């Protein structure tokens, strides 16, 4: 007797005779098991790796009609240890790399029982889920990433997967912080998988990633912007400086050359050529060219009135020559990464 | 008394019949779980990551009615396995990222017993959490970490946080030093948030980390300032001997930018430009203009003109230092009243 | 008809990176309207706004503006708005938002 004692025989009473071995309606329709996500972070999205971290807690919820308790009203908030010795959905996502259950104290856990037998059983988790990206237009790239959420031992006739609450199943996508990136949005999606052993439910849940320029136009762009100006201070230097025009020339290309290399060491071995190496590629051709060109003012002026009107004539075109390029160049590349 | 078996069936009459799954009071008043913590160590705190990782002990205080006794004068002491078979809160860090119960020999828990069935569950625990930075005023900022701590299951219907000892709960960080920050100030709360599943109540642990600027005024000003300065040798250096400006210069120039990338080997990839970028620029631009007045004295001395280039070069001796004056000036200034 | 509020933020704005837009009236408790992350611009609505209200965020005057367009009868109300803190939970509920505007009334 007690409204202690009376809830302890209650739940030995639910729990004597319970099979952990069957599903809900074993042998009868497929077990309705909705569920919803509470982001709680990103920790960061790896090129090198083409993974994510992903920080969530995830809901799940479904009927369990030998649960069903009668007289008491409460929602029973049983101790977490109690979910071992349950049946629970086989739930899996299928693009994780690796992943935990988050385990100081205490597991982090919570389940819940109602008394028409519904059962809430949800937990926080940390998952490595993999996201290949497409660098071709990187840094002024998107990216999709994605978590595949799927039942691996029970097919569609025997689970059915649903986000509860529909488009609002989830929740906590603006407290996701990541410096390089913006979600743009995210979007839920409910299919069904097919194998060879059968068919199964699957829930998507994607983010569509913009990257946020900032970095890369100060760090990278800018140094090779400058470099190039930097080059064509050799059309104002006189020609008479022979020493001089090639130690502009050649230092801007080597640090042409350095900029890139601190690149490489920080991304993956991509096949292709990205928007980044065809900027880096065409402030390199500028530098190499001014160089080509002071070769051929020195070329022209010493050993070849054309021995001083070509020299004279080709150093005053350099100075604007140089610029307009580049300017066209820029204008293209632009516009070519942003207007199309 | 404390006869060894009168204390071995106490004790098992205590267990024998109770339930892991109901909490103390279950369907009555919540259970008062007292708070409190003993800080032995921030192990770090990183821009890079965005956290701090944290060492401490970890006690909580609750009197469980199932557990009184009578007979036995001792506060008992237990194996710290008898943490399986009672019921413990579900308390656990929200931003942690990754945490673990130190368990050397034998896992780090403790329970105590009292006659009025009050018990001390206490635990060593590691903690790594999440804390990103307001690095806009990179070498001369301050934060704000906090270690935010909720139940996981039981809602403010079944649970309440207090600290226990109010204001003196939290202890240890008064002998907390850090390499790169100082300890200025912290605060403890209490609050309960809500959720759709219910209120939930939460005790959060706070700290004002000052920075110390020693270590950028050693690594990052000095090889800067040093190097700028470099850069008005050229003035000293006579438009006659044409080709060493240039080199000076460009030195100067690929010297700046080394300087640069070493930050940018030991920062997050942030958007936005910090103060020490800011101070970089700075240095550069003059670095710049240096090389950049090399190249227009070339211009003037070969378009009296010697005499133009000299009256630059004395006019660029006196200028430089007077420009970065004001340009030093007006950024400690702005950087330090803002 | 259609209107326009903005909220200006001051002091340590970085501890509070999410903004959120309530409402009340005489006989109801406050409602939800919107919310905004700094730096972010990922704003979720009210289903009772959604589609007519849009956040925004103007990061360097450190203030966030609400768009209140096609104006109904009953959006007469109260729209205070209110800060949130870093780890602080659910946002369609008041009492995890900190600080508080003044509640500037709007009369349709």
């Known amino acids: 007797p007690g409204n202690m004692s009376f809830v302890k025989e209650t739940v030995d009473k639910l729990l004597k005779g319970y099979d952990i071995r069957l599903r809900p309606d074993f042998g009868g329709p497929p077990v309705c098991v909705g569920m919803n996500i509470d982001i709680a972070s990103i920790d960061m999205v790896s090129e090198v790796n083409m993974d994510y971290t992903l920080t969530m807690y995830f809901q799940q919820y479904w009927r369990d009609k030998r649960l069903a308790y009668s007289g008491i009203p409460l929602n029973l908030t049983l101790d977490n240890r109690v979910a071992d010795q349950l049946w629970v959905p086989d739930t899996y996502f299928l693009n994780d790399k690796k992943s935990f259950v988050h385990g100081v104290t205490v597991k982090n856990r919570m389940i819940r029982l109602h008394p028409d037998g519904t059962v809430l059983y949800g937990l926080r988790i940390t998952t490595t889920a993999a996201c290949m990206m497409d660098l071709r237009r990187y840094p002024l790239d998107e990216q999709n990433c994605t978590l595949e959420i799927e039942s691996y031992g029970y097919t569609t006739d025997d689970i059915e997967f649903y986000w509860r609450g529909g488009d609002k199943a989830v929740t906590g996508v603006e407290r996701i912080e990541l410096p390089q990136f913006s979600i743009v949005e995210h979007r839920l999606v409910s299919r069904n998988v097919v194998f060879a052993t059968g068919a199964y439910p699957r829930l998507s849940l994607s983010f569509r990633l913009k990257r946020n320029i900032g970095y890369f136009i100060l760090q990278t762009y800018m140094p090779s912007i400058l470099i190039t100006i930097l080059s064509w201070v050799s059309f104002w230097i006189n020609y008479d400086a022979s020493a001089a025009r090639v130690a502009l020339g050649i230092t801007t290309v080597l640090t042409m050359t350095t900029i890139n290399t601190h690149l490489r060491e920080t991304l993956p071995k991509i096949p292709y050529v990205k928007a980044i190496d065809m900027y880096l590629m065409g402030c390199f051709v500028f530098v190499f060219l001014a160089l080509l060109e002071y070769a051929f003012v020195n070329y022209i002026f010493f050993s070849q009135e054309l021995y001083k009107g070509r020299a004279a004539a080709i150093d005053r075109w350099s100075r604007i020559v140089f610029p307009f390029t580049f300017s066209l160049f820029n204008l293209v590349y632009w516009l070519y990464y942003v207007n199309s | 008394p404390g006869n060894m078996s009168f204390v071995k069936e106490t004790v098992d009459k205590l267990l024998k019949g109770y339930d892991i799954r109901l909490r103390p009071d279950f369907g009555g008043p919540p259970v008062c779980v007292g708070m409190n913590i003993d800080i032995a160590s921030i192990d770090m705190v990183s821009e890079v990551n965005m956290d701090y990782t944290l060492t401490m002990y970890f006690q909580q205080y609750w009197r469980d009615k199932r557990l009184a006794y009578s007979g036995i004068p001792l506060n008992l002491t237990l194996d710290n396995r008898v943490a399986d078979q009672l019921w413990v809160p579900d308390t656990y860090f929200l931003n942690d990222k990754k945490s673990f119960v130190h368990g050397v020999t034998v896992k780090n828990r403790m329970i105590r017993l009292h006659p009025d069935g009050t018990v001390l569950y206490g635990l060593r625990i590691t903690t790594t959490a999440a804390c990103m930075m307001d690095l806009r005023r990179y070498p001369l900022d301050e934060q704000n970490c906090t270690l935010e701590i909720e139940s996981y299951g039981y809602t403010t219907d079944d649970i309440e946080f207090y600290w226990r000892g109010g204001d003196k709960a939290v202890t240890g960080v008064e002998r907390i030093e850090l390499p790169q920050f100082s300890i200025v100030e912290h605060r403890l709360v209490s609050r309960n948030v809500v959720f759709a599943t219910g209120a939930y109540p939460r005790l959060s642990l706070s700290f004002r980390l000052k920075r110390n600027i020693g270590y950028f005024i050693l690594q990052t000003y000095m090889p800067s300032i040093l190097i700028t300065i470099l850069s008005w040798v050229s003035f000293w250096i006579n438009y006659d001997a044409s080709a060493a400006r240039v080199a000076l210069g460009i030195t100067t120039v690929l010297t700046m930018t080394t300087i640069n990338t070493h930050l940018r080997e030991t920062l997050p990839k942030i958007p936005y430009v910090k103060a020490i970028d800011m101070y970089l620029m700075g240095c550069f631009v003059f670095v710049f203009l240096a090389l950049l007045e090399y190249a227009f004295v070339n211009y003037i001395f070969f378009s009296l003109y010697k005499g133009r280039a000299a009256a630059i070069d004395r006019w660029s001796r006196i200028v430089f230092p007077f420009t970065f004056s004001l340009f030093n000036l007006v950024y400690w200034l702005y950087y330090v009243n803002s | 008809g259609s209107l326009r509020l903005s909220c200006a933020a001051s002091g340590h704005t970085f501890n509070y990176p999410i903004m959120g837009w309530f409402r009340q009236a005489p006989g109801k408790e406050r409602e939800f309207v919107g919310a905004?992350?700094?730096?972010?611009?990922?704003?979720s609505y009210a289903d009772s706004v959604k589609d007519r209200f849009t956040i925004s965020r103007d990061n360097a005057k450190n203030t966030v503006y609400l768009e209140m367009n096609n104006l109904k009868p009953e959006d007469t109300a109260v729209y205070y708005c209110?800060?949130?803190?870093?780890?602080?939970?659910?946002?369609?509920?008041?009492?995890?938002?900190?600080?508080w505007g003044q509640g500037t009334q709007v009369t349709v």
């Open positions: 905004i992350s700094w730096s972010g611009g990922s704003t």
């Open positions: 209110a800060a949130k803190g870093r780890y602080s939970g659910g946002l369609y509920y008041p009492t995890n938002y900190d600080y």
